[PDB]
Specification:
mainly beta; 2 helices; binds lauryl dimethylamine-N-oxide; binds fe (iii) ion; iron transport; transmembrane beta strand; ion transport; transmembrane
Length: 647
C-alpha cells in the first residue's frame, strides 16, 4: 500500500496483470498507465531491443527524460551522458511488477527525474523452491509477415534453510511482428541471489547477461505505404547489442528504528548496428562501462507527538563510453565492417556525486516530507579524429516537498513540488544549437491529487504542472541538435476500477475500469514555434475495459484510444511525401481475451487465447528526425495464445 501512501502521482502494475491484454513487452504494460505514452517501435528504436516511452508529453523517443531503473540499478548504458535506450537490457518476463512514479520521488532518485522514475521489480526468489514458465505467440493475419512472434519466460529458484536463496530468471523473444524485415532474437538471462544468515544482516546480488539482435522495418513514404503498408524499404537496417551486469548489495538492520543499505553495481554494454544514412551505409559500435556505489541510511525517531523518519544518502557513479562509425557507399552493395573507413571516433565520460537528505514527518493526519537532492557532475568528450577535448561540470540543487493528508481511512489527498534536471548529454557537448549553447535542462514540477480505495471502488485523480527551461531533439540525418525552447506540461491524470457485483448478483465477478489523462504540452519558447504543441503528445489518451472472472474462467475486454498528434515542432498538418512530417490521427482500438485455469492446484496450468485490435482498425505513427523516417503501420488484428505453468 506504499503507493496508496505515496505523496504524488504513482502506479504499479503487478505481474498477475500483464497477461490481461496479452502484453508481451514493457511498452504494452506502460501504455495502460495514465499519463504514460509508449509508442510502437519506430525511428532509431524501430525494434524490440530499445524502449520508447515518455510521460506527460515528454519526448517518448528512447525513454530519455525519465530515471529508469531495475531493482534500483540504472538501466541506461549511460545514465548521464546518453540516457537514450536504443538498447534496453530489461524484459517484462523477469519482472514481478512495474513501478512508475511520475511525482513524489526526485530526491532519492536521479538524475533524469523530470519524466518520472520507472523501476522494474525483478521476480522474487522462491521462499522454498518453485518453477514457473510461460509463453505467448502472436500472428498478424492481414499482414504479409508470416513469421510469428513467440516470447517466453522461465523462473527456477528456491531458498536453502541456511538463509541462502538463488533464482534463475530467463526471458526470451523470437520472431517478427506485423512488419517485413523485423525478425528478432532476444535472450535475457539473470542470476539472482540473497543471503540472510540471520535477521539483521542480508546480502543480495544480481547477475545478468542480455544479448539481442533485431532487423528494423523502418518508415515508409506515402506512395509505398499506400501500395503495401507491411513492407520495409530499409533492407540494410539492423540493430544488436549485449549487456553484462553485476550488482552486490548489503543491508544492516539492528532494529526497527535503524536501517543501513549499501549497493554497488557494474554494467558493461555494447550496442551497435547497420543503418542506411544518406548515400552511405554505416556501422556504429558503441561501448559503455558503468560503476557506482551507493550507501544510504534511515533512522526513525519520535519528537513529541510526531514521528520523524530521516533519510540520507549518497551515490558515486562513473561512466565511460567509446563510439565509432564505419561506413561504405550505399551505392555499393557492400555492408560496412571492421577494416572500412570510419568517420567518428569519440570517447566520452561522466563522474557524478549525488547527495540526498529527506525527512518523512507524521503529525496527526499529516505526513510532510521535505527533501533535498544535490548533484555535482563532471563530463568530458574526447574526439580522437578532430582531436578536441571538451569538458563540463555543473551542480544541481533540487529542493522538494511532499505533503499527504489522510482524509479518511481509505481516501488521501496529496501535493508536491520536486526539482529535476537533465544533464548535458555527450552528443551535445559540442553545443551546436541556434539558441547559443546546449543544456543543462532544469525543470520544476507541481502536483495535486487524491487517491481512493474501499474494496469496491478504487479510484484516483490528480493535476500536474511542469516547467522546463529547454528541450533538445536529435535529427540523426544531419547530426545536429534541434532546439525547441522552454516548454510547459499541464494536465490531469485519473483512473478507476469498480466491482459491479456490489450493485447486483447478476454482475457478480464483473469488474469495469477506465484510465484517462488530458495532457497539454506546449512550447513557451519565444519565436516561430511559440504556442505550438510539443510533438508526439496526444491531448487525450486512456483505456477502458471489463474483466469477468466466473469460476476458473477469465474474460477480458478492453479499449485503447487517443487523439491526434504532431510530428515536428512546426506542427505541420499537411503530410510530406516521405511520410515523416504531417498530422498523426487519433484512434480507438478494441481487444478481447478468454482464459481458463485448470485446477488452480495441480500445476497452476493456465491457457488463454485472444485478439488485439478486433476491428482491424487502421492507424499509424511517424518517425520525424531519424534516418528511417516515415509512416509506420500500426498493429492490425493480431491473434495470440498464452500458456502458463507453475510448480
Ligand atoms: C507460438 C505460439 C503458437 C500458438 C498457437 C495458437 C495460434 C495463435 C492463434 C490464437 C487464437 C485466437 N482466437 C481467439 C482468435 O482464437
Ligand atoms: C536456462 C535457459 C536459459 C537460456 C540461456 C540462453 C543463452 C544466453 C546467451 C546468448 C547467446 C546467443 N547466441 C546465439 C548469439 O550465441
Ligand atoms: C572481480 C571481483 C569484483 C571486485 C570489484 C571490487 C568491489 C569493491 C566494491 C564494493 C562493493 C560493496 N557492496 C556491498 C555495496 O556491494
Ligand atoms: C559516518 C558518516 C559518514 C558516511 C557518509 C557516507 C560517505 C559519503 C561520502 C563520500 C565523499 C565523496 N567525495 C569524493 C565526493 O568526497
Ligand atoms: C563507502 C562510500 C564509498 C564512497 C567512495 C567515494 C568514491 C570517490 C572516489 C574518487 C576517485 C575516482 N577515480 C575513479 C577517478 O579515481
Ligand atoms: C556526512 C554527511 C553530511 C554531508 C551533508 C550531505 C547531505 C546531503 C545533502 C545535499 C545538500 C548539499 N548542499 C550543501 C549542497 O546543500
Ligand atoms: C492531537 C494533536 C494533533 C496535532 C495536530 C497538528 C497539526 C499541525 C498542522 C501541520 C500542517 C503542515 N503544513 C505545512 C503542511 O501545512
Ligand atoms: C510553495 C512551497 C515551496 C516548496 C519548496 C520548493 C521550492 C520551490 C521554488 C522553485 C521555484 C522555481 N521557479 C524558477 C520556476 O520559479
Ligand atoms: C470531514 C472532515 C473534513 C476534513 C478536511 C481537512 C483536510 C485539510 C485539507 C488540506 C489537505 C491538503 N493536501 C492536498 C495537501 O492534502
Ligand atoms: C500551497 C502549496 C500547494 C502547491 C500548489 C502550488 C502550485 C503553484 C504553481 C505555480 C508555479 C509557477 N512557476 C512557473 C513559477 O513555477
Ligand atoms: C461506492 C462507494 C461510495 C463511498 C461514498 C464515499 C465517497 C468518496 C468519494 C470518492 C473519491 C473519488 N476520487 C477519485 C475523486 O477521489
Ligand atoms: C480551456 C482549456 C481547458 C481544457 C479542458 C480539458 C480538461 C478535460 C478533463 C476532463 C476530466 C474528466 N474526468 C471526469 C473523466 O476525469
Ligand atoms: C447470471 C449470469 C449472467 C451474467 C451476466 C453477464 C454480463 C457480464 C458481461 C460479460 C463480460 C464479457 N467480456 C468478454 C466482454 O468481458
Ligand atoms: C472536446 C474534447 C475532445 C474530446 C475527444 C476525446 C478523445 C476521444 C478519443 C479519440 C478517438 C477518435 N476516433 C474517431 C478516431 O476514434
Ligand atoms: C475462441 C478461443 C476459446 C479458447 C478458450 C481457451 C480456454 C481453454 C478451455 C477451458 C475449458 C475448461 N473446461 C474444463 C471447463 O472444460
Ligand atoms: C535457449 C532458448 C530455450 C528457451 C526455453 C524457455 C522455456 C520457456 C517455456 C515456456 C513453457 C510454457 N508452457 C506453459 C506452455 O509450458
Ligand atoms: Fe542514435
Ligand atoms: Fe546519434
Amino acid at each position: 500500500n506504499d503507493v496508496f501512501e505515496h505523496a504524488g502521482a504513482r502506479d504499479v502494475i503487478r505481474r498477475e496483470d500483464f497477461a490481461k491484454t496479452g502484453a508481451t513487452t514493457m511498452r504494452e504494460v506502460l501504455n495502460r498507465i495514465p499519463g504514460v505514452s509508449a509508442p510502437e517501435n519506430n525511428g532509431t528504436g524501430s525494434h524490440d531491443l530499445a524502449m520508447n516511452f515518455g510521460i506527460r508529453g515528454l519526448n517518448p523517443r528512447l525513454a530519455s527524460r525519465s530515471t529508469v531503473l531495475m531493482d534500483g540499478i540504472p538501466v541506461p548504458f549511460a545514465p548521464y551522458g546518453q540516457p537514450q535506450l536504443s538498447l534496453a537490457p530489461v524484459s517484462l518476463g523477469n519482472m514481478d511488477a512495474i513501478d512508475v512514479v511520475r511525482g513524489g520521488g526526485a530526491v532519492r532518485y536521479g538524475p533524469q527525474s523530470v519524466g518520472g522514475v520507472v523501476n522494474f521489480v525483478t521476480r522474487a526468489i522462491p521462499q522454498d523452491f518453485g518453477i514457473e514458465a510461460g509463453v505467448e505467440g502472436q500472428l498478424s493475419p492481414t499482414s504479409s509477415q508470416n513469421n510469428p512472434k513467440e516470447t517466453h519466460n522461465l523462473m527456477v529458484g528456491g531458498t536453502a534453510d541456511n538463509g541462502f536463496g538463488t533464482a534463475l530468471l530467463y526471458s526470451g523473444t523470437r520472431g517478427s511482428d506485423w512488419r517485413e524485415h523485423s525478425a528478432t532474437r532476444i535472450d535475457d538471462l539473470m542470476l539472482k541471489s540473497k543471503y540472510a544468515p540471520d535477521e539483521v544482516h542480508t546480502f543480495n546480488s544480481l547477475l545478468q547477461y542480455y544479448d539481442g539482435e533485431a532487423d528494423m522495418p523502418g518508415g515508409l513514404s506515402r506512395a509505398d505505404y499506400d501500395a503495401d503498408r507491411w513492407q520495409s524499404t530499409r533492407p540494410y537496417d539492423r540493430f544488436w547489442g549485449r549487456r553484462k551486469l553485476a550488482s552486490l548489495g548489503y543491508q544492516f538492520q539492528p532494529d526497527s528504528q535503524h536501517k543501513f543499505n549499501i549497493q554497488g553495481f557494474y554494467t558493461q554494454t555494447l550496442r551497435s548496428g547497420y543503418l542506411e544514412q544518406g548515400k552511405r551505409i554505416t556501422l556504429s559500435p558503441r561501448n559503455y562501462w558503468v560503476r557506482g556505489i551507493e550507501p544510504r541510511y534511515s533512522q526513525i525517531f519520535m519528537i513529541g507527538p510526531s514521528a520523524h523518519e530521516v533519510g540520507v544518502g549518497y551515490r558515486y557513479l562513473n561512466e565511460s563510453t567509446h563510439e565509432m562509425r564505419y561506413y561504405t557507399a550505399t551505392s555499393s552493395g557492400q555492408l560496412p565492417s571492421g577494416s572500412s573507413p570510419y568517420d567518428r571516433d569519440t570517447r566520452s565520460g561522466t563522474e557524478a556525486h549525488a547527495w540526498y537528505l529527506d525527512d518523512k514527518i507524521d503529525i496527526g493526519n499529516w505526513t510532510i516530507t521535505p527533501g533535498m537532492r544535490f548533484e555535482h557532475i563532471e563530463s568530458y568528450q574526447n574526439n580522437a579524429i578532430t582531436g578536441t577535448h571538451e569538458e563540463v561540470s555543473y551542480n544541481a540543487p533540487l529542493p522538494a516537498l511532499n505533503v499527504l493528508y489522510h482524509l479518511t481511512d481509505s481516501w488521501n489527498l496529496y501535493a508536491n513540488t520536486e526539482g529535476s534536471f537533465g544533464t548535458v548529454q555527450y552528443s551535445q557537448i559540442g553545443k551546436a544549437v541556434q539558441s547559443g549553447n546546449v543544456e543543462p535542462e532544469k525543470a520544476r514540477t507541481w502536483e495535486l491529487g487524491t487517491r481512493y480505495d474501499d474494496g469496491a471502488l478504487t479510484a484516483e485523480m490528480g493535476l500536474f504542472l511542469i516547467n522546463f527551461n529547454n528541450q533538445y531533439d536529435s535529427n540523426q540525418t544531419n547530426d545536429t541538435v534541434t532546439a525547441r525552447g522552454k516548454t510547459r506540461h499541464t494536465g490531469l491524470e485519473t483512473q478507476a476500477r469498480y466491482d459491479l457485483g456490489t450493485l447486483t448478483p447478476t454482475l457478480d465477478n464483473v469488474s469495469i475500469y477506465a484510465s484517462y489523462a488530458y495532457v497539454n504540452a506546449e512550447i513557451r519558447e519565444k519565436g516561430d514555434t511559440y504556442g505550438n504543441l510539443v510533438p508526439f503528445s496526444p491531448k487525450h489518451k486512456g483505456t477502458l475495459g471489463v474483466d469477468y472472472k466466473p469460476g476458473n474462467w477469465t474474460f477480458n475486454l478492453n479499449s485503447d484510444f487517443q487523439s491526434s498528434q504532431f510530428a515536428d515542432n512546426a506542427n505541420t498538418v499537411k503530410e510530406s511525401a516521405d511520410g515523416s512530417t504531417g498530422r498523426i490521427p487519433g484512434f480507438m482500438l478494441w481487444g478481447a481475451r478468454v482464459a481458463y485455469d485448470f485446477g488452480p492446484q495441480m500445476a497452476d496450468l493456465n491457457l488463454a487465447f485472444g485478439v488485439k485490435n478486433i476491428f482491424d482498425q487502421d492507424y499509424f505513427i511517424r518517425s520525424y528526425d531519424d534516418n528511417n523516417k516515415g509512416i509506420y503501420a500500426g498493429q492490425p488484428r493480431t491473434l495470440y495464445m498464452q500458456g502458463s505453468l507453475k510448480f
